[PDB]
Amino acid sequence: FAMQMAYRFNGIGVTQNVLYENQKQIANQFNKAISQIQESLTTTSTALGKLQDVVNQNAQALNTLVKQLSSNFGAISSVLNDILSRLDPPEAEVQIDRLITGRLQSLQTYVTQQLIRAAEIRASANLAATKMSECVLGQSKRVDFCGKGYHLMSFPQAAPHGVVFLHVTYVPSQERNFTTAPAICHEGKAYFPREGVFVFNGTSWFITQRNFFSPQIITTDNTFVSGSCDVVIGIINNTVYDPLQ
C-alpha cells in the first residue's frame, strides 16, 4: 500500500521522500478523516438529498396519477359503473367517452414526464460511470472532476438507487512568502531550473517543488544551461554547486 501511495504522490508533484518520511502522521490523518465522514453521515444530516429527492417525485408522480383516477373529467360519475347503471347506452357512451379521453390524457401526462425523468437519470448515471472509471480506477490529473484540489484516490459506496463517492484529496496549506527569480546567472551563463522553482530564504538561494517547501543545493543536474545571461529578464547572480568538482 505504501508503494501505491508514494507513486500516487509522484502523480501529484510531490516526491516519494515526503510519504516515506511522513507515513505515520499522514495515515493518522487519513484515519481521522474516515472517522469524520463516519460521524458526519452518522448524524441526521441529510446531505444525500440528491439520492432522496428522486424517489419523492416518483411517489408524488404516482400519487397524482392515482388521485387523477378519482377525479372525473367532464363526467358526472367518477366511477364508471355508475355511468353504466344510470343512463341509456347512447348518452352513457358520451359520458364514458369523456372519461376515457380524460383518463388517457392523464396517462400521457404521466408517460411524457416519466420519459423526461428517464433522460435526466440517464445523464446523471452516465456521469456516474465516468466518475467510477476515471476516479476509483486511476489517479486523475483532471482537476475538480473527482475532488477539490489534487486527487489522490477514490472509494465507492453503494446506496439505495445511487452511488456515494468518497474522495481522498490533497490540499496544501501554511503559506510562506519567498524571494524568487526566474533564473540564475552562474558564470556569465544562464541556467534554468528543471521541475522546480528557485527560492531565497534570506541567506542563499535554493531549489524546491511547488507543494512542499524543501530546499536543495542548486546542481548541474538540477538545471540546464540555455542562452546567455543578458537575455533573461530579472536573472540574478549566484553559484551552482557541482558535486564532482
Partner 1 sequence: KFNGLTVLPPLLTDDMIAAYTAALVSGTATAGWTFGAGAALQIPFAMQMAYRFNGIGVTQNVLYENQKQIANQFNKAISQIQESLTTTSTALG
Partner 2 sequence: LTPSSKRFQPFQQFGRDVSDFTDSVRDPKTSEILDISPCSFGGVSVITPGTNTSSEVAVLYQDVNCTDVPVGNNVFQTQAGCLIGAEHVDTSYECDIPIGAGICASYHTVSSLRSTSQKSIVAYTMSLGADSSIAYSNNTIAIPTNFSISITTEVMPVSMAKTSVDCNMYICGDSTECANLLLQYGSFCTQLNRALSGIAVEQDRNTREVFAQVKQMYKTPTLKDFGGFNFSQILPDPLKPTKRSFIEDLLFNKVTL
Ligand X SMILES: *[C@@H]1O[C@H](CO)[C@@H](O[C@@H]2O[C@H](CO)[C@@H](O)[C@H](O)[C@H]2NC(C)=O)[C@H](O)[C@H]1NC(C)=O
Residues that bind ligand NAG (CB under 6 A): 177, 233-234
Site for partner 2 in 156-185 (CB under 8 A): 157-181
- Interface with ligand X, residue 41, by CB under 6 A: no
For the window 206-245, what string marks contact with a copy of itself as x by the rule CB under 8 A? ----------------------------------------
Closer CB to partner 1, 102 or 182, in the complex: 182
CA 76, 77, 82, 83 dihedral sign is positive
CB closer to a copy of itself out of 102 and 215: 102
Contacts to partner 1 by CB under 8 A? 133, 136-139, 141, 143-144, 148-150, 171-173, 175, 180, 182-183, 190, 192, 194-195, 197, 210, 224, 226-227, 231-234
- Could you tell me the CA-to-CA distances from 30 to 15, 23, 59, 81, 168 in Å, in that order? 19, 10, 40, 67, 8
CB atoms within 10 A of CB 164: 15
Binding status of residue 112 toward a copy of itself by CB under 8 A: yes
CB of 197 to a copy of itself, least distance (A): 16
Report if residue 25 touches ligand X, rule: CB under 6 A. Answer: yes
Q: Which of ligand X, partner 1, ligand NAG, none does residue 203 bind to, with CB < 5 to 8 Å depending on kind?
A: ligand X
d(CA 29, CA 22) in angstroms, rounded, equals: 11
Q: What SS3 class is residue 218? A: coil
All cell numbers assigned to 1: 500500500
Binding-site member from 59, 115, 171, 244 for a copy of itself (CB under 8 A)? 115
User: What does the alpha-carbon distance between residue 185 and residue 207 come to, in Å, rounded to a whole number?
Assistant: 15
Secondary structure letter of residue 216 according to DSSP? B
Quote the least distance from Cβ 124 to ligand NAG, whole Å: 34
139 binds, among partner 2, partner 1, ligand NAG, none (CB under 5 to 8 A by kind): partner 1
Is residue 201 close enough to count as binding ligand X by CB under 6 A? yes
Cα–Cα distance between 109 and 18 in angstroms, integer? 60
In three-state secondary structure terms, 197 is strand
**22 touching ligand X, by CB under 6 A:** yes
Residues 157-186, mask of contacts with a copy of itself (x by CB under 8 A): ------------------------------
Nearest to 185 by CA among 229, 241, 233: 229
* SS3 of residue 152 by DSSP: strand
Other residues' Cβ atoms within 10 Å of the Cβ of residue 12: 18
Q: H or E segment at 106?
A: helix 89-131
Contact residues for ligand X, defined by CB under 6 A: 22, 25, 185, 201, 203-204, 236-237
